[PDB]
Each structure stands twice: as structure tokens, then as C-alpha cells.
């Protein structure tokens, strides 16, 4: 195959043949692709409308080039809590906060992330400011996970071959199909997760990729455009279980959640967002907390769905019970401190 | 305006705002665009179907950075004979053949061109293979048009700022909206022409750009896929006249043209394309001659179209009759030779 062959086809508004997206991404990962070819491919693939197979081959190749974690160090039931980003809105780090709470409820967590692309502080940014280390390689992410209950995979450190593509996509400035990869390329390959998507027309495609692996994942998009489960309004959820997707709308009001204004969830620089995490874990009641509990519940229901013998509602109310208890007992706050303390000790 | 604004809008399948296409082009020409941005723009402008205004803006910006010809050196009734190519044939043998016939019939021709991408011989290549100096500055092109009756503007010499876009578009290696520009960025700004386009949908767009200029133009797509008037079957013509456009069907059988086969008309190697020209200008009667004569008449008919008193069928017979004569008298063969001598006498 070739670039004009592949680019020609996409610009003809045609789905690619099996293996074509993989060859293209492999060319990219292996540094054999000129910056203009990367850009054309990325834009062309977005405007055509990508398929699950296509994006699955993109994520597949990427993973196959990624640093893996050591064998028998990632639990069978580990969850991820990560979004695509591209909110447009500049919220406090909801995914990061819920991750800590989830791990504090004793659900193993291997989080993928990096810095903000558009926002003032990313997950990795906010974690850095807290004094939790985001540099850790495969072996120490494995250690951290077993020793603290949570581990953090920093995307650049696990995905060096993405460097070629990453610079190019920054220059473009528009989001593309590539903005989907982060959540689909966690190097630990955890089989569950809560997965945020800022682009409502692409979210089904992510769900499609997760269903191919037979993951238990809720792909989420707030109807306010949030790549999290919102408290402002309702959220659309593509539930991924048993290798099939199904669409839902989710209403916090049915679990007694006060509706909220978007700007109550608004965020700032790293220090500020790190202050917000200390606040919430510390027990500050209000909008931000509600948001964190909600999403933390979400991930826990995805965990629960690893088992086929599971109903939606009883699992959500268990989830909300546990996220809330994880904060209120101080266990969440403990865990963060335990985790910082882990990093300062090789 | 902005790159992210313009690229995002395109990726939403939205037509641009008045001025944006121009701003994008203007950044490219000025050197203010990343190759990643050039690539995203060219791909997206294509997949979202481009409009006449958008392409006019791109053409206009390009023309406003170009070296013009000296004042009062291009006659008001000058014509261009040219195709988009990318027919995948090629047509270069036909366009340069008709161009010379036309000039030889006493219609000033100023052609715009480049060395080929897809085919072995292209407009400039074939010209260069016949001994013609294709790379002359504005003054010498005017002197050529004055003395020889034809001039060729070499797109690299006349559009220095376009260098960036060309390098980028070579790498993506597939047709984009930028492939319509050549015919619409003649530095000599000639107000008539026969304009071949391999893209049916884009032809109508090119036509509307020429309508905006009040040029008298026949945009032509061979219904056999050719970017010239074919003799293989019927053609589609977009008659541009009085700032308006009429889509037509054209059949050369109504002038006694035998149906040829597509593989008797196809351009080839530059050294081959050259010999074919000597062959046919020397008097080689056949299906190549036929189709040169046809396209040459189209060019002359287009020239006739500058007067609103011009009528269609008589214009075509005067056209056919004059092109035939230019060949048979040897005026055309003789014109090629004076054009070659001209270059050798500077
Ligand atoms: O910067 P953007 O492209 O707008 O993306 C929004 C943020 O989301 C990502 O983190 P992640 O989703 O892992 O965690 P978060 O939701 O807690 O930030 C990333 O780190 C960004 O800072
Ligand atoms: O890009 P390609 O597909 O190789 O096209 C071959 C040639 O056709 C065009 O020139 P010209 O208009 O002189 O020839 P045509 O009008 O017959 O296409 C184009 O500028 C090339 O020189
Ligand atoms: Mg998120
Ligand atoms: Mg977010």
C-alpha cells in the first residue's frame, strides 16, 4: 500500500480496506511518514467519518509499539478513568479526582494521561503539582499499583513513537480522529473504565473499539459538551458490555443530584486545580464533589460490569455508596498522601 | 481569522465565511503557514465540496502575489488553452498541440503551465522537449507573444510564493482543490480560453469562477473522463459568457468526427509527446489530429465568444475551418519553429 492510495481513498469519502489504517499508523509510529502525510491522513480520516475497525487499527498499532507493563502486575479487573479532552470548557480535573476515589474504594486503577492540550491544567499537570510522580516507567507503575492501589501511566513516557505524530497534530490545532487514541491506548490494557469523549459524533466509534476488546466501559459525553458525566444536565452513555454497545441518556436527578451551573465546575492553573483536589478529598461539600462522586460511581459500575451477573441500578447505587464512603472515611485523602509518599521513596 | 477556526469549520462540513479562504491562502503565500496546516486545508477544502467563491478567493490571492506582465503587453482578446489534467492519461499532448494551432491561426495565446506530476510528459516538459524556452520572465514572455504570437508562463517563475504549497501537495500525492488553480492563476490574466477539467463536479465550480471574471470561456469535461474535448464520445461544456454559465452537451459527430478510442488519444512520454506533435504538425492525419483540431476550434470559438454578437454553430465552423488551415498551410509547424528560434535569439 501507499500514502496516495490511502489518502486518495479517504478523500473519495470511502472506508479503508482492512489493514490500511494499520499500515498508515505503523508508518507514522516508525517515523517513515512526512508531516504533510500525517496531517492529510488525520484530517481525511475525520471528515470521512471513521469506523470502529479503522480506529481500532490505529489504537492497535500504537499499543503494539508501546512500552508494556511487566507480566502479572496488572489486575484482571483494573479500571481506567480518562477522557479525550477537547472540552472547550476549562473544568477542574474531574477524571483525576474520581480515579483517586475509585482506587480508595479499593478498585484497582491504572490511569493514562498527560498535560492539557487546550485547558489550563491537565491530569498529569494537576497530579504533578500535588507531588504525585508522573514520570514512573513500567516497573514502578506496576509497583505503585500494588503498593498504593493506584498507578499512573504518562502517555509520552509509554508512547515514545507517538512523538512524530504529536508535534504535527499540535500545529494543526483542530481536533481529529487522533484525539480518540489516548483513552484507547492505555499501556496497561485495563479491561474496564469510565471513558470521556468531548465529541458526541465520535463517541459511538470509541465504544465500538472498546466492544471489540470485550471491555466493560461506559463511554460518556455530557449534553453540555463535557467529556465527563455532568451535573449540569443529562449525559449520553454508550454502555459497552459483552462485546455490544447500547446508547443511553443518564439523569443525575434520578439519584437525588442537584442540577448545577457549568461555571461552578470551572478550573484554573495547576496549583489552583491541585487546591480543588485537596478541598474535595478533604470533605468540602458542593458542586465539584457531586461531579467527582458521580463519575467515580460511573467507573465503579464499569468495574462491576466485568461480571455478566450485574444490573445497572443496583450497581450505580452501590457505586455512589462507595465513592461517597471513600471520601467521607478519609480513605481517599489517605491514599493521595500514601501515593505522594510512595514517589518520594524510589 | 484563524487556522483552528477555519480548519474546524471545514471539518464541520460548513462552507467558509467570505474572506477566510483568502486569509488561508494569504498565510500560505506569505510563508506564515505550517506544512501541517497547508495539508489540512487542502484536504479539508476538498472533502467539504468547495465553492466558486472559495476557489476564486484562493485564485485571487495567488494572482495578487504573482509577477504580472508589463502594462499594455497582453491583448484584450488573448486566450489560454489548458487542462487541470489528473485525467490520468495524459492530455498534455492535446493542449500544447491545440495551443500552437490556435496561435498559428492568429489568435494570441498565452499559456500557463508547469512540469508534470502524474504523466511522463507534461505541458512544460513536452514544450522543453521540442526546444522551447519555457522559463522566461514577464518582459520576454510579452516579447514572445508580440513576436511569435504565443507565450508560456512557467508557474514556478511567476508564482515564487507558491513553492511551499507545491512541495506539501507533492507529498500528500493526491488531487486536491489546489489542482484547479493552474487554469485560474494565469499571470497574464487572459479573458478567454478552453479549459479542461478531469473533475466533473469541479468543472462547474471552475466555470463559476470564470463567470465572476466575465471571461468568455469553454470549460470542458469529456464524458469519457478526459480533461479535453474528446472524440471518444460526447463532452460536457460549460459555456461561460456575459458573466453567466450554460451547461451543455457537445457531440463532435455533428461535424463529421469519427469516433476514436481513448487509447489512441492519450499523451505519454515527454519525448513521445514531442514526436507526436511534430508528426501531427507535419501533417499526420489521424485521431490525434482530429482531437487537436476540435480543441483548437473550441479555443477559437471561446475567442469568438468575447463579442456578444457571436453565434454558436457558425463560430464552430469558422473554428474547425481555421484550425484545419493552420495545420495544412504549415503555419503551425512554422510557428513552433519561430518559437524555438525566438528562445535561441536572446
Ligand atoms: O486539555 P484538553 O485537551 O482540553 O483536555 C482536558 C484534560 O483532560 C485530560 O486529562 P484526563 O481526561 O485524563 O483527566 P481530567 O479529566 O481530570 O483532566 C488532559 O490531561 C486535559 O488536561
Ligand atoms: O498533472 P498531470 O495529471 O500530469 O497533467 C498533465 C498536464 O496537464 C496539464 O497541462 P496542460 O493543461 O498543458 O495539458 P492538458 O490541458 O491537456 O491537461 C498539467 O499542467 C500538466 O502539465
Ligand atoms: Mg476526563
Ligand atoms: Mg475534563
- Site to probe by mutation for ligand 1, drawn from A80, A82, A122, A175 as the one with most ligand atoms within 8 Å of Cβ, is A122
Q: Which run of H or of E encompasses A278?
A: helix A270-281
Q: How far apart are CA B104 and CA A63, in angstroms?
A: 65
**Chain A residue with Cα closest to B7:** A174
| B230 within 8 A of B265, measured Cβ to Cβ | yes
Nearest to B47 among A13, A34, A36 (CB): A13
Q: How far apart are CA B183 and CA A159, in angstroms?
A: 46
> Which ligand 1 atom lies nearest to the CA of residue A124?
20
Question: Is the distance from CB of B40 to CB of B73 less than 8 angstroms?
Answer: no
Phi then psi for residue B316, to 5 deg, are: -70, -30
Indicate which technique resolved this structure. Answer: X-ray
The cell for B197 is 477539467
Q: Is residue A235 within a helix (H) or strand (E), and if so which, with residue range?
A: strand A235-241
Long-range contacts of B25-32 (CB under 8 A, 24+ apart): B25/B57, B25/B58, B25/B61, B25/B62, B26/B61, B27/B3, B28/B161, B28/B164, B28/B165, B29/B61, B29/B62, B29/B65, B29/B161, B29/B162, B30/B161, B31/B161, B31/B164
Instruction: Kindly tell me the burial class for residue A282, based on how many C-beta atoms sit within 10 Å of its own C-beta (0-12, 13-18, 19 or more).
Output: exposed
Closest chain A residue by Cα to residue B172 = A37
Distance set, CA A243 to CA A80, A177, A211, A230, A239 (Å): 18, 22, 4, 26, 10
Q: Using only C-alpha atoms, what is the Rg of chain A?
A: 19
The whole-angstrom distance between B201's CA and the closest CA on chain A is 13
List C-alpha distances in Å: A10 to A51, A204, B160, B174, B199.
Answer: 12, 20, 31, 11, 17
**The total number of residues written for chain B in this structure:** 346
Residue A94 Cα to ligand 4 midpoint, Å, equals 6
Q: Which helix (H) or strand (E) holds A179?
A: none
Rounded distance from Cα A2 to ligand 4 centre (Å): 37
Question: Is the Cβ–Cβ distance between B220 and B82 less than 8 Å?
Answer: no
Q: Which domains are present in chain A?
A: 1-66 (1.20.970.10), 75-346 (3.40.1030.10)
Point out the residue among A37, A173, A176 whose CB comes nearest to the CB of B172.
Answer: A37
Task: Give the C-alpha distances (Å, rounded to integers) separating A59 from A18, A177, A212.
Answer: 14, 11, 12
B122 lines ligand 2 (CB under 6 A): yes
Contacts of A168 in chain B (CB under 8 A): 36
All residues of chain B having their beta carbon less than 8 Å from the beta carbon of residue A173 are: 3-4, 7, 37
- Measure Cα distances from A110 to A102, A322, B59, B205 in Å: 11, 19, 53, 53
3-state DSSP of chain B: CCHHHHHHHHHCCCCCCCCHHHHHHHHHHHCCCCHHHHHHHHHHHHHCCCCHHHHHHHHHHHHCCCCCCCCCCCCCCCEEEEECCCCCCCCHHHHHHHHHHHHHCCCCEEEEECCCCCCCCCHHHHHHHCCCCCCCCHHHHHHHHHHCCEEEEEHHHHCHHHHHHHHHHHHHCCCCHHHHHHHHCCCCCCCEEEEECCCHHHHHHHHHHHHHCCCEEEEEEECCCCCCCCCCCCEEEEEEECCEEEEEEECHHHHCCCCCCHHHHCCCCHHHHHHHHHHHHHCCCCHHHHHHHHHHHHHHHHHHCCCCCCCHHHHHHHHHHHHHHHHHCCHHHHHHHHHHHHHCCC
Q: Could you give the strand order of the β-sheet that contains A244-250, starting from the edge strand earlier in sequence? A: A150-154, A109-113, A79-83, A192-196, A216-222, A235-241, A244-250
Quote the minimal CA–CA distance from B293 to chain A in Å.
Answer: 34
A339's grid cell: 501515593
Cell representation of residue A90: 476549562
> Ligand 2 centroid vs B219 CA: distance in angstroms?
15
Tell me the CA distances in angstroms from B222 to B46, B102, B182, B248, B271, one per residue in order: 22, 20, 19, 12, 25
* A61 within 8 A of A191, measured Cβ to Cβ: no
Resolution to one decimal, Å: 2.5
> How far apart, in whole angstroms, are the C-alpha atoms of residue B111 and residue B104?
14
Cell of B144: 514572445
Contacts of B226 (CB under 8 A, 6+ apart): B87, B89, B91, B196, B198, B232, B235, B262, B265
- Give dist(CA B92, CA B85) in Å, integer: 8
Ligand 1 binding pocket (C-beta < 6 A) is: A 82-83, 85-87, 93-96, 113-119, 122-124, 196
Q: How far apart are CA A150 and CA B336, in angstroms?
A: 80
- Scanning the structure block, which residue is given the C-alpha cell 508560456? B152
Shortest CA gap B12–chain A (Å): 8
**Treating both helix axes as pointing N-terminal to C-terminal, what angle do A138-148 and A331-343 enclose, rounded to 10 degrees?**
150
Ligand 2: distance of its center to the CA of B97 in Å?
A: 12
Give the up-direction half-sphere exposure of residue B290: CA atoms within 13 A in the CB hemisphere: 18
d(CA B84, CA B220): 10
Ligand nearest the Cα atom of residue B87: 2
Q: Taking Cα atoms as reference points, which of B218, B217, B252 lies closest to residue B233? A: B252
Which sign, positive or negative, has the C-alpha torsion B308, B309, B311, B317?
A: negative
In angstroms, what CA-CA distances link B167 with A167, A168, B31?
19, 17, 13
Amino acid at each position: 500500500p501507499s500514502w496516495p492510495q490511502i489518502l486518495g481513498r479517504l478523500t473519495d469519502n470511502r472506508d479503508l480496506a482492512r489493514g490500511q489504517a494499520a499500515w498508515a499508523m505503523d508508518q507514522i509510529m516508525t517515523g517513515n511518514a512526512r508531516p504533510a502525510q500525517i496531517a492529510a491522513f488525520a484530517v481525511a480520516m475525520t471528515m470521512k467519518a471513521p469506523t470502529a475497525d479503522e480506529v481500532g487499527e490505529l489504537a492497535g498499532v500504537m499499543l503494539s509499539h508501546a512500552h508494556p507493563l511487566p507480566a502479572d502486575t496488572v489486575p484482571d479487573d483494573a479500571v481506567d478513568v480518562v477522557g479525550t479532552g477537547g472540552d472547550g470548557v476549562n473544568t477542574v480535573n474531574l477524571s483525576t479526582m474520581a480515579a483517586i476515589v475509585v482506587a480508595a474504594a479499593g478498585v484497582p486503577v491504572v490511569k493514562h494521561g498527560n498535560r492539557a492540550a487546550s485547558s489550563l491544567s491537565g491530569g498529569a499537570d494537576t497530579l504533578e503539582a500535588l507531588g504525585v510522580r508522573i514520570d514512573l516507567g513500567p516497573d514502578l507503575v506496576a509497583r505503585s499499583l500494588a503498593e498504593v492501589g493506584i498507578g499512573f501511566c504518562f502517555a509520552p513516557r509509554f508512547h515514545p513513537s507517538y512523538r512524530h505524530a504529536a508535534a504535527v497534530l499540535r500545529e494543526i490545532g483542530v481536533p481529529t480522529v487522533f484525539n480518540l487514541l489516548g483513552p484507547l491506548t492505555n499501556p496497561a490494557r485495563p479491561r474496564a473504565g469510565l471513558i470521556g469523549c468531548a465529541f458526541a459524533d465520535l463517541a459511538e466509534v470509541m465504544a465500538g473499539v472498546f466492544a471489540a476488546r470485550r471491555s466493560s466501559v461506559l463511554v460518556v459525553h455530557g449534553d453540555d459538551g463535557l467529556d465527563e458525566l455532568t451535573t449540569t444536565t443529562t449525559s449520553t452513555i454508550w454502555r459497552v458490555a459483552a462485546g455490544s454497545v447500547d446508547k443511553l441518556t443518564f439523569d443525575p436527578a434520578g439519584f437525588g443530584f442537584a442540577r448545577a451551573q457549568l461555571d461552578q465546575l470551572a478550573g484554573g492553573d495547576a496549583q489552583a486545580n491541585a487546591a480543588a483536589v485537596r478541598a474535595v478529598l478533604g470533605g468540602a461539600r458542593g458542586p465539584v464533589r457531586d461531579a467527582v462522586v458521580l463519575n467515580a460511581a460511573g467507573a465503579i459500575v464499569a468495574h462491576a460490569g466485568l461480571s455478566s451477573r450485574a444490573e445497572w441500578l443496583p450497581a450505580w447505587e452501590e457505586g455512589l455508596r462507595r465513592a461517597s464512603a471513600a471520601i467521607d472515611t478519609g480513605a481517599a485523602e489517605q491514599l493521595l498522601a500514601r501515593w505522594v509518599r510512595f514517589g518520594r521513596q524510589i
